Write a protein that binds this DNA or RNA. Structure first.
Length: 92
DNA sequence: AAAGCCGGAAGTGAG
DNA sequence: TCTCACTTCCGGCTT
C-alpha cells in the first residue's frame, strides 16, 4: 500500500516538512498544489527505489489517476489537483 | 519557438 | 510464473 502513489501523496500532504514540494490549497475540499514538480518526481522515484524517474513520467501516472477518477485537474491555477475519493474509498 | 500538458499503447519491476 | 500499478515512448494539442 505504501508503494501506491495516492498513498504517498496523502502522506506528504499530512507532513508539513514537504510544504515546498506539495501542499493543500483547500484542505477541506481536498484541493492540493504541486509546488516543485522536479523535486517531487525525485522523492517518488526514490520512494519506489527506481532510476530515471521524471515528472513527465510521474504526471502520466497522475493522468492515469484521471482515468481511475482518483484525482482530477482543478482549473484554478497550474499544477492544482483535487482528490475525488478518500483513502477509504480508493481501497473500497 | 519552446515548454507543458494530454491520452493511446506498449513495456515492466515487484508482490 | 502472472498480474497490477504504474512506467516508457510519443504524436498531438495547449500555454
Amino acid at each position: 500500500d505504501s508503494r501506491l502513489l495516492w498513498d504517498y501523496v496523502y502522506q506528504l500532504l499530512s507532513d508539513s516538512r514537504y510544504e515546498n514540494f506539495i501542499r493543500w490549497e483547500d484542505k477541506e475540499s481536498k484541493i492540493f498544489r504541486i509546488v516543485d514538480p522536479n523535486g517531487l518526481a525525485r522523492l517518488w522515484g526514490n520512494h519506489k527505489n527506481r532510476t530515471n524517474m521524471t515528472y513527465e513520467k510521474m504526471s502520466r501516472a497522475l493522468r492515469y489517476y484521471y482515468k481511475l477518477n482518483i484525482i482530477r485537474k482543478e482549473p484554478g491555477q497550474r499544477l492544482l489537483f483535487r482528490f475525488m475519493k478518500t483513502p477509504d474509498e480508493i481501497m473500497s
